[PDB]
Structures are given as C-alpha cells and as structure tokens.
Design a protein around this motif. Structure first.
Motif, PDB file in Angstrom:
ATOM      1  N   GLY A 105       7.974  24.357 -29.464  1.00  0.00           N
ATOM      2  CA  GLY A 105       8.363  23.760 -30.724  1.00  0.00           C
ATOM      3  C   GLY A 105       9.715  23.087 -30.694  1.00  0.00           C
ATOM      4  N   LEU A 106      10.613  23.543 -29.826  1.00  0.00           N
ATOM      5  CA  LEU A 106      11.889  22.856 -29.692  1.00  0.00           C
ATOM      6  C   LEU A 106      11.730  21.533 -28.959  1.00  0.00           C
ATOM      7  CD1 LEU A 106      14.358  25.697 -28.905  1.00  0.00           C
ATOM      8  CD2 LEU A 106      14.134  24.427 -30.994  1.00  0.00           C
ATOM      9  N   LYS A 107      10.839  21.477 -27.970  1.00  0.00           N
ATOM     10  CA  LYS A 107      10.572  20.209 -27.304  1.00  0.00           C
ATOM     11  C   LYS A 107       9.807  19.257 -28.200  1.00  0.00           C
ATOM     12  CE  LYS A 107      10.529  21.969 -22.674  1.00  0.00           C
ATOM     13  NZ  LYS A 107       9.724  22.211 -21.449  1.00  0.00           N
ATOM     14  N   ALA A 108       8.940  19.781 -29.057  1.00  0.00           N
ATOM     15  CA  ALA A 108       8.197  18.918 -29.957  1.00  0.00           C
ATOM     16  C   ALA A 108       9.065  18.381 -31.076  1.00  0.00           C
ATOM     17  CB  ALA A 108       7.007  19.665 -30.539  1.00  0.00           C
ATOM     18  N   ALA A 109      10.178  19.038 -31.377  1.00  0.00           N
ATOM     19  CA  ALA A 109      11.101  18.560 -32.391  1.00  0.00           C
ATOM     20  C   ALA A 109      12.247  17.747 -31.814  1.00  0.00           C
ATOM     21  CB  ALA A 109      11.671  19.732 -33.184  1.00  0.00           C
ATOM     22  N   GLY A 110      12.421  17.749 -30.501  1.00  0.00           N
ATOM     23  CA  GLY A 110      13.489  16.982 -29.901  1.00  0.00           C
ATOM     24  C   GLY A 110      14.830  17.673 -29.895  1.00  0.00           C
ATOM     25  N   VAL A 111      14.854  18.975 -29.644  1.00  0.00           N
ATOM     26  CA  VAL A 111      16.087  19.743 -29.570  1.00  0.00           C
ATOM     27  C   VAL A 111      16.320  20.077 -28.105  1.00  0.00           C
ATOM     28  CG1 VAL A 111      17.278  21.797 -30.269  1.00  0.00           C
ATOM     29  CG2 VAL A 111      15.821  20.634 -31.865  1.00  0.00           C
ATOM     30  N   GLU A 112      17.388  19.527 -27.533  1.00  0.00           N
ATOM     31  CA  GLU A 112      17.631  19.589 -26.098  1.00  0.00           C
ATOM     32  C   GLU A 112      18.690  20.618 -25.720  1.00  0.00           C
ATOM     33  OE1 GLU A 112      17.876  16.867 -27.991  1.00  0.00           O
ATOM     34  OE2 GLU A 112      19.829  15.897 -27.768  1.00  0.00           O
ATOM     35  N   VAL A 113      18.792  21.707 -26.478  1.00  0.00           N
ATOM     36  CA  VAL A 113      19.741  22.764 -26.160  1.00  0.00           C
ATOM     37  C   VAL A 113      19.255  23.534 -24.940  1.00  0.00           C
ATOM     38  CG1 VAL A 113      20.906  24.781 -27.050  1.00  0.00           C
ATOM     39  CG2 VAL A 113      20.390  22.915 -28.555  1.00  0.00           C
ATOM     40  N   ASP A 114      20.142  23.728 -23.974  1.00  0.00           N
ATOM     41  CA  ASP A 114      19.813  24.455 -22.765  1.00  0.00           C
ATOM     42  C   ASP A 114      19.675  25.946 -23.046  1.00  0.00           C
ATOM     43  OD1 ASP A 114      22.481  24.808 -23.366  1.00  0.00           O
ATOM     44  OD2 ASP A 114      23.184  24.543 -21.312  1.00  0.00           O
ATOM     45  N   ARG A 115      19.080  26.665 -22.095  1.00  0.00           N
ATOM     46  CA  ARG A 115      18.825  28.083 -22.299  1.00  0.00           C
ATOM     47  C   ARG A 115      20.078  28.936 -22.187  1.00  0.00           C
ATOM     48  NH1 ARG A 115      14.499  25.662 -20.212  1.00  0.00           N
ATOM     49  NH2 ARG A 115      12.467  26.272 -21.027  1.00  0.00           N
ATOM     50  N   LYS A 116      21.180  28.394 -21.672  1.00  0.00           N
ATOM     51  CA  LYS A 116      22.438  29.128 -21.684  1.00  0.00           C
ATOM     52  C   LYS A 116      22.990  29.235 -23.091  1.00  0.00           C
ATOM     53  CE  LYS A 116      26.172  27.091 -20.486  1.00  0.00           C
ATOM     54  NZ  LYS A 116      27.187  26.440 -19.640  1.00  0.00           N
TER      55      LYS A 116
ATOM     56  N   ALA B 150      22.244  33.960 -37.393  1.00  0.00           N
ATOM     57  CA  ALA B 150      21.690  33.279 -38.548  1.00  0.00           C
ATOM     58  C   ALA B 150      21.405  31.812 -38.289  1.00  0.00           C
ATOM     59  CB  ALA B 150      22.631  33.414 -39.743  1.00  0.00           C
ATOM     60  N   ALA B 151      22.045  31.216 -37.289  1.00  0.00           N
ATOM     61  CA  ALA B 151      21.727  29.858 -36.885  1.00  0.00           C
ATOM     62  C   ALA B 151      20.637  29.809 -35.831  1.00  0.00           C
ATOM     63  CB  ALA B 151      22.975  29.149 -36.364  1.00  0.00           C
ATOM     64  N   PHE B 152      20.340  30.937 -35.185  1.00  0.00           N
ATOM     65  CA  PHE B 152      19.166  31.021 -34.329  1.00  0.00           C
ATOM     66  C   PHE B 152      17.890  30.984 -35.150  1.00  0.00           C
ATOM     67  CE2 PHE B 152      16.042  33.082 -31.665  1.00  0.00           C
ATOM     68  CZ  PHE B 152      16.285  32.495 -30.455  1.00  0.00           C
ATOM     69  N   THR B 153      17.919  31.548 -36.357  1.00  0.00           N
ATOM     70  CA  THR B 153      16.744  31.541 -37.216  1.00  0.00           C
ATOM     71  C   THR B 153      16.469  30.143 -37.747  1.00  0.00           C
ATOM     72  OG1 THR B 153      17.209  33.826 -37.806  1.00  0.00           O
ATOM     73  CG2 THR B 153      15.695  32.650 -39.211  1.00  0.00           C
ATOM     74  N   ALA B 154      17.526  29.374 -38.015  1.00  0.00           N
ATOM     75  CA  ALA B 154      17.353  27.993 -38.446  1.00  0.00           C
ATOM     76  C   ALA B 154      16.819  27.096 -37.339  1.00  0.00           C
ATOM     77  CB  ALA B 154      18.670  27.435 -38.977  1.00  0.00           C
ATOM     78  N   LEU B 155      16.895  27.523 -36.078  1.00  0.00           N
ATOM     79  CA  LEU B 155      16.226  26.832 -34.986  1.00  0.00           C
ATOM     80  C   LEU B 155      14.793  27.287 -34.792  1.00  0.00           C
ATOM     81  CD1 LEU B 155      18.922  26.754 -32.224  1.00  0.00           C
ATOM     82  CD2 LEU B 155      18.149  24.893 -33.624  1.00  0.00           C
ATOM     83  N   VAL B 156      14.507  28.564 -35.052  1.00  0.00           N
ATOM     84  CA  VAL B 156      13.138  29.059 -34.980  1.00  0.00           C
ATOM     85  C   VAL B 156      12.297  28.441 -36.088  1.00  0.00           C
ATOM     86  CG1 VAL B 156      11.793  31.181 -35.165  1.00  0.00           C
ATOM     87  CG2 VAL B 156      13.756  31.116 -33.737  1.00  0.00           C
ATOM     88  N   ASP B 157      12.904  28.151 -37.237  1.00  0.00           N
ATOM     89  CA  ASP B 157      12.174  27.494 -38.313  1.00  0.00           C
ATOM     90  C   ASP B 157      11.931  26.012 -38.059  1.00  0.00           C
ATOM     91  OD1 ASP B 157      11.931  29.819 -39.791  1.00  0.00           O
ATOM     92  OD2 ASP B 157      13.835  29.498 -40.832  1.00  0.00           O
ATOM     93  N   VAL B 158      12.650  25.390 -37.130  1.00  0.00           N
ATOM     94  CA  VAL B 158      12.336  24.019 -36.738  1.00  0.00           C
ATOM     95  C   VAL B 158      11.285  24.002 -35.638  1.00  0.00           C
ATOM     96  CG1 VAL B 158      13.330  21.870 -35.871  1.00  0.00           C
ATOM     97  CG2 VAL B 158      14.580  23.233 -37.473  1.00  0.00           C
ATOM     98  N   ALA B 159      11.342  24.957 -34.714  1.00  0.00           N
ATOM     99  CA  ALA B 159      10.322  25.074 -33.684  1.00  0.00           C
ATOM    100  C   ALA B 159       9.002  25.617 -34.205  1.00  0.00           C
ATOM    101  CB  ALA B 159      10.822  25.965 -32.556  1.00  0.00           C
ATOM    102  N   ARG B 160       8.948  26.061 -35.454  1.00  0.00           N
ATOM    103  CA  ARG B 160       7.704  26.478 -36.073  1.00  0.00           C
ATOM    104  C   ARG B 160       7.065  25.353 -36.871  1.00  0.00           C
ATOM    105  NH1 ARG B 160       6.074  31.688 -36.869  1.00  0.00           N
ATOM    106  NH2 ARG B 160       8.180  32.546 -36.614  1.00  0.00           N
ATOM    107  N   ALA B 161       7.849  24.375 -37.310  1.00  0.00           N
ATOM    108  CA  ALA B 161       7.319  23.268 -38.090  1.00  0.00           C
ATOM    109  C   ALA B 161       6.800  22.133 -37.228  1.00  0.00           C
ATOM    110  CB  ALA B 161       8.390  22.725 -39.038  1.00  0.00           C
ATOM    111  N   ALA B 162       7.436  21.867 -36.092  1.00  0.00           N
ATOM    112  CA  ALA B 162       6.965  20.820 -35.203  1.00  0.00           C
ATOM    113  C   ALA B 162       5.849  21.289 -34.295  1.00  0.00           C
ATOM    114  CB  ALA B 162       8.114  20.289 -34.354  1.00  0.00           C
ATOM    115  N   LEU B 163       5.569  22.578 -34.285  1.00  0.00           N
ATOM    116  CA  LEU B 163       4.464  23.103 -33.514  1.00  0.00           C
ATOM    117  C   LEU B 163       3.161  22.678 -34.188  1.00  0.00           C
ATOM    118  CD1 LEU B 163       4.532  25.040 -31.114  1.00  0.00           C
ATOM    119  CD2 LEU B 163       4.305  26.906 -32.636  1.00  0.00           C
ATOM    120  N   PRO B 164       2.116  22.357 -33.424  1.00  0.00           N
ATOM    121  CA  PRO B 164       0.897  21.813 -34.031  1.00  0.00           C
ATOM    122  C   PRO B 164       0.153  22.845 -34.863  1.00  0.00           C
ATOM    123  CG  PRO B 164       0.560  22.186 -31.718  1.00  0.00           C
ATOM    124  CD  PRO B 164       2.018  22.372 -31.957  1.00  0.00           C
ATOM    125  N   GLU B 165      -0.762  22.336 -35.692  1.00  0.00           N
ATOM    126  CA  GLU B 165      -1.384  23.155 -36.730  1.00  0.00           C
ATOM    127  C   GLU B 165      -2.314  24.208 -36.140  1.00  0.00           C
ATOM    128  OE1 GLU B 165      -0.598  22.995 -39.926  1.00  0.00           O
ATOM    129  OE2 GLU B 165      -2.017  24.569 -40.490  1.00  0.00           O
TER     130      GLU B 165
END
Ligand SMILES: [Mg+2]
Ligand SMILES: [Mg+2]
Ligand SMILES: [Mg+2]
Ligand SMILES: [Mg+2]
Ligand SMILES: [Mg+2]
Ligand SMILES: [Mg+2]
Ligand SMILES: [Mg+2]
Ligand SMILES: [Mg+2]
Ligand SMILES: [Mg+2]
Ligand SMILES: [Mg+2]
Ligand SMILES: [Mg+2]
Ligand SMILES: [Mg+2]
Ligand SMILES: [Mg+2]
Ligand SMILES: [Mg+2]
Ligand SMILES: [Mg+2]
Ligand SMILES: [Mg+2]
Ligand SMILES: [Mg+2]
Ligand SMILES: [Mg+2]
Ligand SMILES: [Mg+2]
Ligand SMILES: [Mg+2]
Ligand SMILES: [Zn+2]
Lengths: 60, 174, 146, 37, 213
Positions: A17-28, A39-54
């Motif tokens: 979902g992060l690749k489907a949304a275009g978020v290029e943050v490395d795993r470090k 609390a900002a990790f959750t705001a990234l999980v909510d973007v990787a859940r929306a760009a993930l397909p249905e």
RNA sequence: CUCGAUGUCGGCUCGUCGCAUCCUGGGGCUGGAGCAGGUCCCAAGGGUUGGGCUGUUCGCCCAUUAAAGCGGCACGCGAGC
RNA sequence: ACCGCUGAAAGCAUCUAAGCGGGAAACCUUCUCCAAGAUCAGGUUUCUCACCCACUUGGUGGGAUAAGGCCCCCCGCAGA
C-alpha cells in the motif's frame, strides 16, 4: 511488522500500500517512526490501507 | 433403510431431550444414551422416535443406522427385558446358585464362581440349564460371553458351555 | 543510529491465556511470541523484552485423539538402555502442565537468553492461578486478516 | 490365523473384511482364517 | 497400620526353640521411644510420626534443637528419625509424648530391619563387585586383580555410565526384609530377631513391621 | 581414509546392544483323543553348565540341564593380560 | 498376539466406523537404594533476632559480636 500488527495490518500489505500510494520512505526510517513517533506511523498505515486494491486476492 | 423408520412407545414415561440426550422408563428401570451430534432426535405425532441426518456423507450414513438400533434397544429392554438361555453340556458338569452368584463345576480342581454385576440377575431352571437376565442388551451379552469362554472349546467330546440352539464344530479324534 | 533499548526501558505486563479449546501448537506459538516481545516495536534480539504469560487450564488443551495414543516423549538418562519413553496420553493424566510447557520451550531460540525468558512462564493445570496480586489482562488469540 | 502378505478366500463361504487397518479373511472353517502381515 | 521402633544392635547370640533347633539371633535393644512431632497432610503434605531415642546429657544439645523438644514437652534425646505411614491414620493412635516400648511387636511377627552397613573403605573390584580377576600364573603380568577391559573400541569412544569400577564400599542404608521375631522381652526392652542385621555393634536400627511377610 | 606406522587369529578379564527366541511367559491352526509334538503369531525381563581332543574358530564326543540361542560393536576388548 | 459384546455404512452379516470388555516374565505403579546444583535450587520447624566507626552517604567500606560451626587436642570397627 510489530508496529503494523497493532494497527491491524500485515507487513505484507503495508509495503504494497505504500508503493501503491507513492511513499518512498526507506525501511530504516519507517522502523524509527515506529518507535519514536507511534501516532504518525498510524497515519501512514491509513494511507497504505486506502491505496490498497479493493480485493487483494482478485486478479490484476 | 434403518433409521428412516419410527420407533413406538408403549409406556416410555420420561421420553426427554435435553441437549441431545434421551432416557426411558417403564415396567423396568431407567437407561441413558448420548447420540453423536450430527444425528438429531425428536418425537413424531404418535410419540414415536424418528432420527434425521444431513444427507449423503460416509460418516453420517453409518451413524444414522447405528443410533436408531440403540434407541430401539433402550425402549425394548425397559419394557420387555433381555434373557439369554444357556446350556451346560458334558457329564458331571452342572451349575448352582449361592445367593446372587452362580457356581460352576467345569471339570476343574476348584469351583468356578461368577459374581453377577449391578443389574444382571441369574436364575437356573435345571441342573444343566440356566438363564442370564437383565435390561441392557450390551450389558447382558457381555456377561453371557464371559460364561461361554469358561472352558477352552472341546470339539472331540463336546463338553463345555454353549448358547442354546447353537451347534459347535466337531472333529472325530481317535 | 537505529534504536537500541537501554536498561530500565523494557516495560512488562501480565497476560493470562485460557487454554480451553485451543490446540497445543497455536497456544505454544502465541505464548512464545508473547514471552519474547515480538509484538512490541522495540524488539531487539539480544534484549529480553516481553511479558509474563500465565497459562491456565492446561488439562483442557486440544490434542487429536490419535496423538495421545501414538505421539511419544523420549528421555535418556546417560546409562545404557536408559531411553525411557511415555506418551502424551500418559503425561496428560500426571503432568498436564509439562506438556504445554515442553511445546513452548522448543519454540524458543536455543541460546543463553531463552533460559532467562522461560522463567517468565507459569503453566497451571486447573482454572485457578495464584498470581492474582498482579492484574493479568486476558489475551485472546487473534489473526490479522489480509 | 495364517499370516502371509497375500490373502484371498479359499472356499465359497469365506469373507474378506478389513478391521483395524488390515485385511483379513474370516470364515466358519477355522483353518481358512488369514490376515496380511 | 505399620508399626516401627528405633533401637540399638547389641550383637548376636544363639538360642534354641521347642523343636530343639538352633536359631542364630541378633539382639536388638528396641528401647523406649517418644513421639515429639506428628506430620499431617493438611500441614506437611504427607503423614508420618517422629521418634526420639537415646539418653544424652542436656548440655550436648544445641539451642535450635533444644527448643524443638520444648514445644513437644519432651527431654532431649540423641537420635531423631521418622516412621513413614500411608496417606491416613496417624493422629488416631499416636499422640505427642507417647511412650513406644518394645512390646508393640508380637512373637512370630515378621519385621524389616534397616540400618547402616559396616564400612569397608576404598575397595577394589574383586571385593566391591565380584570380578574374577586374571590368572595367578601362565605368564600373567601384573594384572592379577585388575578389572581388564572397560569399553569397546573406536565405536563407542567412551566408557558407559555405571561401569563397575573401584571405589568406596559400605556405609549405605541397607534394609533387610522379612526377619522373624523369635522372642520379645518387655522386661529388658529387647527383641530377639532371627538372622543378621546391618551395622556395627552399637549402631542405630529402625525396626518396622514387614509388608511382604 | 590411513605407508614421516591405524599392531594381526584364538583364549582370559570386563561389557553393552539388536531380535531373525534356545528356555521360561501369552496365543491361532493342526492329518491337536490324552501325554508329547508340528507350524505360524506376540514377547528381549532374567537365565543360557562343566569336561576330553585340537593354536584353534568351527566341529565331533562325554556327563548333565528348564535350555545349553544366533549376531553387531576396528571379525568389541594387547597405553588391560 | 489373540478371543469377544453391542452395531451401522450394506433391511442380512461383520470385534469397529460411534461406544465397551477380557488379555503376557515385556511397559507403568507397588518393594530396595540414590536424589532440591529439581538454578522452578522445595517443605514443616526451632534458635539468634543485636551493636560501633570511617567516607565521595553508596543494596558503601572496615571493625567487633549472637545463635552456631571450624581449627588445635584425646581417639574410633569412619578413614589414601
Ligand atoms: Mg540457528
Ligand atoms: Mg486391537
Ligand atoms: Mg577399615
Ligand atoms: Mg558381599
Ligand atoms: Mg583367581
Ligand atoms: Mg613387568
Ligand atoms: Mg606377578
Ligand atoms: Mg586398545
Ligand atoms: Mg602421525
Ligand atoms: Mg502352539
Ligand atoms: Mg518378534
Ligand atoms: Mg539376553
Ligand atoms: Mg518389569
Ligand atoms: Mg556378545
Ligand atoms: Mg569375536
Ligand atoms: Mg578383534
Ligand atoms: Mg590378542
Ligand atoms: Mg498383570
Ligand atoms: Mg531418602
Ligand atoms: Mg532448602
Ligand atoms: Zn472357508
């Protein structure tokens, strides 16, 4: 993987979902937001859940 | 064929179902039985017992005909009990009672005693004939089979303990 | 620099796992993840993070009926022909808290620090545990859907 | 019994059944008893 | 349902019975005993009874051990052991302070006498275990009493555990089973026990009732 | 694999294991009357003798015995003989 | 191993698929011995249950005791 399963998603569908949304943050830095700012990790999980397909098991 | 059929109730004064359970009481004592959970049990319009199944599996067709001929063996023995008539053959072999027990003289150097369990009632009818009586078909035939094996089978002289009407095998010997 | 936990930063907690209709291999995995702190994002493999696990009702764990007859537990005493064996069915009568324990300990890493992790496990046979002075929150087994 | 890895009925009233995970031949004649092994 | 007593082996003599047969007996002073403690399952998890034996001067017993007798109301004895019962029936026939003399055993009862065997020191393998040794001639070079081989060869490259070798022999708890009581003597507190009893003359001996008979 | 060394047969001493069981224990079939047997199945807990001849192993023989099993471990065991 | 009882799938029959028995010097308990270094290092008990000094005041260093033990001494049928 530990910080994703508290926000009830897997590591499998988080990288997808992060690749489907275009978020290029490395795993470090994505495993340092997981500790130093939970609390900002959750705001990234909510973007990787929306760009993930249905239907993630449907053919693409 | 078995299981697609109703079971009558002559008296059956406590035909009860509490979470797949059953009981039966009448002219004799009570009994208990638990049916495996894919098989259901209920009452028909006449009070009759009919059991059902989710259709067409190997494991459900076997238990369906099984759990009919156990419920029908509960309502039989409470109304009309079970007796097994047994005969002692051989010269010098006889049988007696000593109270509720039953002592044998089967050619041994000691008498052979059979302690009757809680529900099996003995009664001789002759010195070489007796009957084993009770209400549960599985529990009667267990005790009767313990008496049948009290001697090793002797097909040369025919001596031993038999069920009535059965014909053991025989050899000629010398 | 990536995070390394200082001493005095690992917080701990108490979990009780009712074992009433749970198989021996699900409940060992979920207990061994919980002893080691895999579920915490401050995991480091040299640091004993992780929590205290209480396993009540060890005598009601779900084992297949053909394993109690056939699955064996082997022990050896060092003496010739000292290979003694039992079954699971004749350990669940005597020691049902050793069967649930032995399944967990083989799932921990075979190193020095897991000898320190396995001190945080209490396994009890009955539904009553003596550690009510703490407040063990109950723990149900999840599976994150995907 | 006879214990041989090939069992088959001999006369016309032997029956070939399978109990306890092995194939055996039960009959009224006692010397026709067989099981695989 | 299992009587016991503590005592002292006094040696062996011989005596005759009514059929004019000779009976080698071991005189045991099954002396007077006293209870001092009762083990209960609600307190201790098992069921037993202590027994105190032997005359000691009250200055030779130190202050922790002395106060264990003051709670029982008993003057301090030398020895102190336990009689293991079954899972019940201890405090129905034993009280703290009771006097168990030698006539709890009858004549013709069978007993188990346990004790401590005599010391034999550091013993070799022809004495500790009954090894045969090698020959005394025919060329045998300095191996007359030595064990011989102790293992296999390069499979397995070790000696198996429990291989019978030399070492110290004796001073072990040894129970001798089903010995016959010939004559109880309540006048002297002496049991005449038929046969042999483990120990040196003066050692402590527990005489329990047999179960195999 | 070992040649800048891995000591060979038998016997003595001390063993441990397998079961393809010699004895004892439980059984099915028998052309098993009984007593003894035959054959197959289960079973390794313990026991399995002393002598004559031969360097022997093996083998024949003598006298017994509940029976005198068969094998692996550098054809176990020479920094033990 | 083997002999069963009740009983279906398979209107019968079958020791089995549900369920329950008898059954060997093998296995486990029982009898004998070791054993809490069983680092989960156990239990029931009784005894002492108390002071002083220094310093960077620390779960800190020393000193002196209690209960109790060890060394020395007379020895042992306990023993290299
Ligand atoms: Mg590894
Ligand atoms: Mg079977
Ligand atoms: Mg000496
Ligand atoms: Mg000796
Ligand atoms: Mg000699
Ligand atoms: Mg020399
Ligand atoms: Mg010499
Ligand atoms: Mg060598
Ligand atoms: Mg070299
Ligand atoms: Mg036979
Ligand atoms: Mg075999
Ligand atoms: Mg052997
Ligand atoms: Mg045994
Ligand atoms: Mg050998
Ligand atoms: Mg050889
Ligand atoms: Mg060799
Ligand atoms: Mg040689
Ligand atoms: Mg038995
Ligand atoms: Mg002890
Ligand atoms: Mg302690
Ligand atoms: Zn036939």
């Amino acid at each position: 993987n530990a910080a994703a399963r508290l926000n009830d998603i897997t590591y499998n569908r988080l990288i997808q979902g992060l690749k489907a949304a275009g978020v290029e943050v490395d795993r470090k830095n994505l495993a340092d937001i997981a500790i130093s700012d939970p609390a900002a990790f959750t705001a990234l999980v909510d973007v990787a859940r929306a760009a993930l397909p249905e239907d993630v098991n449907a053919p693409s | 064929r078995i299981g697609k059929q109703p079971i009558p109730v002559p008296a059956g004064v406590d035909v009860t179902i509490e979470g797949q359970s059953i009981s039966v009481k009448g002219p004799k004592g009570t009994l208990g039985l638990t049916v495996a959970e894919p098989i259901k049990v209920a009452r028909n319009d006449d009070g009759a017992i009919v059991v059902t199944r989710p259709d067409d599996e190997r494991r459900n067709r076997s238990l369906h005909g099984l759990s009919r001929t156990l419920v029908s063996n509960l309502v039989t023995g409470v109304t009309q009990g079970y007796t097994t008539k047994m005969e002692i053959f051989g010269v010098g072999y006889r049988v007696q009672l000593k109270g509720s027990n039953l002592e044998f003289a089967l050619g041994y150097s000691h008498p052979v005693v059979i302690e009757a369990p809680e529900g099996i009632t003995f009664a001789v009818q002759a010195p070489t004939k007796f009957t084993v009586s009770g209400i549960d078909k599985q529990k009667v035939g267990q005790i009767a089979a313990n008496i049948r094996r009290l001697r090793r089978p002797d097909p040369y002289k025919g001596k031993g303990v038999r069920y009535e009407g059965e014909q053991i095998r025989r050899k000629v010997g010398k | 620099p990536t995070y390394a936990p200082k001493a005095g930063d690992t917080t701990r907690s108490w979990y009780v796992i009712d074992a009433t209709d749970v198989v021996l291999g699900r409940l060992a995995v979920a207990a061994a993840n919980l002893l080691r702190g895999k579920h915490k994002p401050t995991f480091a493999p040299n640091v004993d993070g992780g929590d205290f696990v209480i396993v009540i009702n060890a005598d009601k764990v779900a084992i297949s009926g053909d394993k109690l007859q056939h699955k064996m537990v082997y022990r050896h005493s060092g003496y010739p022909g000292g290979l003694h064996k039992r079954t699971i069915g004749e350990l669940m009568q005597r020691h049902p808290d050793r069967v649930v324990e032995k399944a967990i300990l083989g799932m921990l890493p075979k190193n020095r620090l897991s000898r320190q992790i396995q001190r945080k496990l209490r396994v009890y046979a009955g539904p009553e545990h003596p550690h009510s002075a703490q407040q063990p929150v109950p723990y149900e087994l999840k599976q994150v859907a995907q | 019994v006879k214990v041989n890895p090939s069992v088959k009925p001999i006369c016309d009233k032997c029956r070939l059944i399978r109990r306890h995970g092995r194939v055996m031949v039960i009959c009224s004649d006692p010397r026709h008893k067989q099981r695989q092994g | 349902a299992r009587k016991g007593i503590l005592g002292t082996k006094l040696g062996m003599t011989q005596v005759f019975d009514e059929s004019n047969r000779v009976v080698p007996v071991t005189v045991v002073k099954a002396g007077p005993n006293v209870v001092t403690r009762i083990r209960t399952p609600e307190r201790d998890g098992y069921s037993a009874v202590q027994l105190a034996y032997g005359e000691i001067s009250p200055r030779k017993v130190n202050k922790p051990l002395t106060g264990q007798y003051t709670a029982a109301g008993v003057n301090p004895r030398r020895y102190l052991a336990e009689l293991r019962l079954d899972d019940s029936d201890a405090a129905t026939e034993y009280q703290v302070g009771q006097e168990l003399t030698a006539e709890i055993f009858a004549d013709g009862s069978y007993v188990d006498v346990t004790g401590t065997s005599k010391g034999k020191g550091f013993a070799g393998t022809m004495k500790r275990h009954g090894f045969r040794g090698q020959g005394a001639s025919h060329g045998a070079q300095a191996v007359h009493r030595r064990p011989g081989s102790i293992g296999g060869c390069a499979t397995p490259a070790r000696v198996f555990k429990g291989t019978r070798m030399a070492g110290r022999m004796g001073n072990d708890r040894v129970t001798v089973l089903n010995l016959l009581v010939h004559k109880v003597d309540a006048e002297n507190g002496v049991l005449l026990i038929k046969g042999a009893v483990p120990g040196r003359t003066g050692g402590l001996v527990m005489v329990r009732s047999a179960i195999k008979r």
